[PDB]
């Protein structure tokens, strides 16, 4: 039933604004003063409970914290017409940023703020009766996202233990870049995330920009579009908890089905009927077309090509008016294709889910209206190429200690760079070894 | 996150007066000091540069220091001069005499305690202190000597903060004073030890900007100081307004300086274009980036084509797409790839801010860290060695009390700075 | 032609937001005329679901 | 200090730095003895 959302730093808060806008509009949470003055669904139902708790007077409040080290973005949420929702304790803001230094966030500044966050999360976790995971949004390229995200996941992992943690993470794009020190922060972040996360969802901004250029008709996209796409993906994954359906899928089923070995937990995500309003009235959108669509690389939200690897598991979530027989026919057609390949030790490669609630349309939004959608998360060896490119860029910079004095000044030993780089190298070797066929001479 | 300003010498006080006019205009503060703005976004970060006096009023967080009150009386007589707190005006009783050693050692130590007391008093009242901002010329006398004295004292008292200086530096042809090489060399020696980040402007570059780009028939010092106030107010813009990708002085420093001595930067501001001509320019990100790299718009006499970029930063003001910024910076890096140092995979940082400067639809300020600055230091060292070998004017400084070994140390340290720039310029992967 | 200047959040997510609904207001504006609203709720004290029948 | 303005930061009971002194969320507790087992087997008359 319940899930708690933790938003960290700039990307995580900006994606959070779009997420909570969407979940409010889907449930029907409105200003108390603003009477609907119009026809509504009018059915008193428990579905809010996943995200809201009631005070008993009937006010709704959301299960989220907003964490930042610079004030400006959180002070911006405290000043809008959305101030009335969050409990003011939930909106936590520090004094000064971690200045793109992982060492500054982890050692110097986040260490002061971290105990308030754990006390707030405990106060949230005490007001639950069937908590089944945390959703975390952050980017590993910046200083506070890396350092405080690592520190907070470490503390959560000791205190809460076995409970599942699913991350939505914005990684540094392979040639678009925003800051020089991105490789160092991403390597050091990835070292902590490897040990302390149950499922990791991979995002690249260059892929979502390419997808918005090719499929949607936007010449000049901005971050609000990407965050609305992310919000749609999260709504699709959490819909299985909130509405009636033919084949439900609890969040623990993702972890059991997608992760074969405890280190192999980094997953790709894609979404099918990303379509514009002008195209939407020229075409029918049956199940088999969108099932064929989700496997094309033009549909993916991370810049990797799966034709250079092998699938290990796929989880397909269908929402809207779909019938299981059409899903079975689609999956059998996918299985026939020769350019889609599974490792020979994984014969039953697919899990299906079918939910009746169609995706919501947001008044200012850019997506079309569609009766059905499918969302995919899949585990594939192609991901090894992203790490190899980050490690090569790290090696280029680290051969001359190009920036290390900032990190050493803020409290970190030089040895820690080599340890993290060797651990990510071992993760690369794991992906090389796991994908090697266990063929036996006879 | 509040900045404290210090204005020193004639150049510093005039540029500061124009700067505080520009900042007061941007936040809608009347010349009486009353807030008269029309949106909360103006008010909600006013604390960054102003302190609040009782019932409405705002006072600007600046210290004015000079050795003869002529300039101070001129700024006090100016149109916004009344805004400044009377107790914040510090002056002596005899001039700097254009001599660094007198300004640094004799009248400096006499006045310095009252300025440090006021600066400490102002800093410790803040709930969290960001860096200091200082404007001065390096070629002068009280500017160089007392500015670097004060810089050293503030670095002793606040070593964990950031230290930022803005500095005007001598043209190779247009000297205003004969003894410029000594004062410049000693001041650069002091700054390279004490400072965290230092910005440099050539009056020659501003003259060429005005004549070629703006085609002004009769430019005045008010225009040059407006250009400087424009760049200065642009650097702090992300500190004090919302945006899609916030940035900060410390974040700029961490991304711009690869090694702690390499902290001298060039500045530019893009939507510069002369009055009258039907061409508008600046209506899109390609136009700003193309103008941004045009040497006509760069604030130093050295040209980038003789050096290589270690790092660069661009701060954009206005409502714009991140794709146009990102793809333009990628295209510029790919097309001009020989001018970017190859062992760094991406040399440009971008930042985007929602609130443009008044009267421009969009603007960008550019900060560049380029090795061609080494030619300037070589030039200063040449003129210094020519004068010093012949003892050309040294008796004034020695009569104040300096040992010649300070001059030989400062020359050696500057020569080592030139060597370090040259080695990193010609480094290779191998 | 630059009198109106929004920021990106207010332009995309909360465009219909008037200047009277933000935290900062002048000290000479009336407060009784503004309707009361200090939290978010599904219903506006609506009678269809809140009343318990007997 | 960390909160700002307070004389001193209040001590915290929920969490701790030391892993052997922190308080786990999922307390692993005991079932009552009544609700287990089989109970008496009782026969009707056919």
């Amino acid at each position: 039933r319940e899930a708690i959302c933790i938003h960290i730093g700039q990307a995580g808060c900006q994606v959070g604004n779009a997420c909570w806008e969407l979940f409010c509009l889907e449930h029907g949470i409105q200003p108390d003063g603003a009477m609907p003055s119009d026809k509504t669904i009018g059915v008193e139902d428990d579905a809010f409970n996943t995200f809201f708790s009631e005070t008993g007077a009937g006010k709704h409040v959301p299960r989220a914290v907003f964490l930042d080290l610079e004030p400006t973005v959180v002070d911006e949420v405290r000043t809008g017409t959305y101030r009335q929702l969050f409990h003011p304790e939930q909106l936590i803001s520090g004094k000064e940023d971690a200045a793109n230094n992982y060492a500054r966030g982890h050692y110097t500044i986040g260490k002061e703020i971290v105990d308030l966050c754990l006390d707030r999360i405990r106060k949230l976790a005490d007001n639950c009766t069937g908590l089944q995971g945390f959703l975390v949004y952050h980017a590993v390229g910046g200083g506070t996202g890396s350092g405080l995200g690592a520190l907070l996941l470490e503390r959560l992992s000791v205190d809460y233990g076995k409970k599942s943690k699913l991350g939505y993470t914005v990684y540094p794009s392979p040639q678009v870049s925003t800051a020089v020190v991105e490789p160092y922060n991403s390597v050091l972040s990835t070292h902590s995330l490897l040990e302390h996360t149950d499922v990791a969802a991979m995002l690249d901004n260059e892929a979502i920009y390419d997808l918005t250029r090719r499929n949607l008709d936007i010449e000049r996209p901005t971050y609000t579009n990407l965050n609305r796409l992310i919000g749609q993906v999260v709504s699709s994954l959490t819909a299985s908890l909130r509405f009636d359906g033919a084949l439900n899928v609890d969040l623990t089923e993702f972890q059991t089905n997608l992760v074969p070995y405890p280190r192999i937990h980094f997953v790709l995500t894609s979404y099918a009927p990303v379509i514009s309003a002008e195209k939407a009235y020229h075409e029918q959108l049956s199940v088999s077309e969108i099932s064929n669509a989700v496997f094309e690389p033009a549909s993916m939200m991370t810049k990797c090509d799966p034709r250079h690897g092998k699938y290990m598991a796929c989880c397909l979530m269908y929402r809207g008016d779909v019938v299981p027989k059409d899903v079975n026919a689609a999956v059998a057609t996918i299985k026939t294709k020769r350019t889609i390949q599974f490792v020979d030790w994984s014969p039953t490669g697919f899990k299906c889910g079918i939910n009746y609630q169609p995706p919501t349309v947001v008044p200012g939004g850019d997506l079309a209206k569609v009766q059905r959608a499918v969302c995919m998360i899949a585990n594939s060896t192609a991901i090894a190429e992203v790490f190899a490119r980050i490690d090569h860029k790290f090696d280029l910079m680290y051969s001359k200690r190009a920036f290390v004095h900032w990190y050493v000044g803020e409290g970190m030993e030089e040895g820690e760079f080599s340890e993290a780089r060797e651990d990510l190298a071992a993760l690369e070797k794991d992906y090389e070894e796991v994908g090697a066929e266990s063929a036996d001479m006879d | 996150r509040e900045i404290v300003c210090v204005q020193a010498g004639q150049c510093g006080n005039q540029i500061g007066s124009k700067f505080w006019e520009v900042i007061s205009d941007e936040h809608g503060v009347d010349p009486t000091g009353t807030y008269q703005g029309d949106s909360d976004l103006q008010l909600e970060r006013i604390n960054v540069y102003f302190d609040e006096a009782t019932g409405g009023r705002y006072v600007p967080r600046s210290v004015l220091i000079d050795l003869e009150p002529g300039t101070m009386d001129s700024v006090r007589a100016g149109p916004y001069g009344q805004i400044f707190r009377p107790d914040n005006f510090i002056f002596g009783q005899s001039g700097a005499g254009n001599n660094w050693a007198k300004g640094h050692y004799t009248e400096g130590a006499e006045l310095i305690d009252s300025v440090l007391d006021v600066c400490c008093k102002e800093a410790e009242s803040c709930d969290c202190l960001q860096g200091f901002q200082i404007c001065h010329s390096l070629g002068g006398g009280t500017g160089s000597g007392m500015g670097t004295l004060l810089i050293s004292k503030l670095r002793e008292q606040y070593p964990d903060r950031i230290m930022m200086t803005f500095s005007i530096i001598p043209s190779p042809k247009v000297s205003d004073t004969v003894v410029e090489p000594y004062n410049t060399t000693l001041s650069v020696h002091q700054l390279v030890e004490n400072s965290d980040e230092s910005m440099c402007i050539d009056n020659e570059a501003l003259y060429d900007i005005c004549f070629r780009t703006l085609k002004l028939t009769t430019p005045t010092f008010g225009d040059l100081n407006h250009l400087v106030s424009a760049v200065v107010s642009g650097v702090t813009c992300c500190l004090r307004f919302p945006g899609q990708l916030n940035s900060d002085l410390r974040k700029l420093a961490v991304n711009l300086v690869p090694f702690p001595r390499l902290h001298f930067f060039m500045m530019g501001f893009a939507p510069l274009t002369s009055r009258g001509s039907q061409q508008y320019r600046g209506l899109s990100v390609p136009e700003l980036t193309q103008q941004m790299f045009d040497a006509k718009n760069m604030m130093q006499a050295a040209d980038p084509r003789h050096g290589r970029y270690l790092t660069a930063s661009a701060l954009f003001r206005g409502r714009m797409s991140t794709k146009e910024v990102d793809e333009q910076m990628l295209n510029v890096q790919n097309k001009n790839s020989s001018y970017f140092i190859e062992w760094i995979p991406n040399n440009i940082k971008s930042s985007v801010c929602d609130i443009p400067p008044k009267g421009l639809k969009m603007a960008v300020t550019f900060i560049g860290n380029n090795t061609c600055i080494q030619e300037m230091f070589r030039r200063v060292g040449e003129q210094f060695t020519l004068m010093f070998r012949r003892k050309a004017f040294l008796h004034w400084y020695t009569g104040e009390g300096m040992d010649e070994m300070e001059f030989t140390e400062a020359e050696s340290n500057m020569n080592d700075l030139v060597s370090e720039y040259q080695q990193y310029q010609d480094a290779t992967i191998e | 032609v630059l009198n109106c200047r929004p920021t990106t959040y207010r332009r995309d997510y909360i465009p219909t937001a008037q200047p009277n609904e933000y935290r900062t207001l002048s000290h000479k504006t009336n407060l009784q005329d503004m309707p009361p609203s200090f939290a978010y709720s599904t219903y506006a004290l609506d009678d269809p679901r809140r009343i318990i029948k007997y | 200090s960390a909160f700002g303005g307070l004389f001193s930061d209040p001590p915290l009971v929920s969490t701790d730095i030391d892993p052997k002194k922190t308080d786990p969320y999922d307390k692993m507790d005991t079932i009552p003895s009544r609700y287990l087992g089989k109970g008496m087997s009782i026969g009707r008359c056919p």
């Binding site: 009335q84 003011p88 936590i92 803001s93 | 009242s125 | 935290r23 900062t24 | -």
Partner: peptide
């Protein structure tokens, strides 16, 4: 100086803003 930590006197601090803030209306 009385053999202490230099003849410098440190001025006090004026305000200390906290971490969590209220969302009630604020006036100019």
């Amino acid at each position: 100086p009385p053999k202490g930590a230099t003849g410098v006197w440190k001025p006090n601090t004026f305000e200390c803003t906290s971490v969590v803030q209220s969302c009630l209306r604020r006036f100019y």
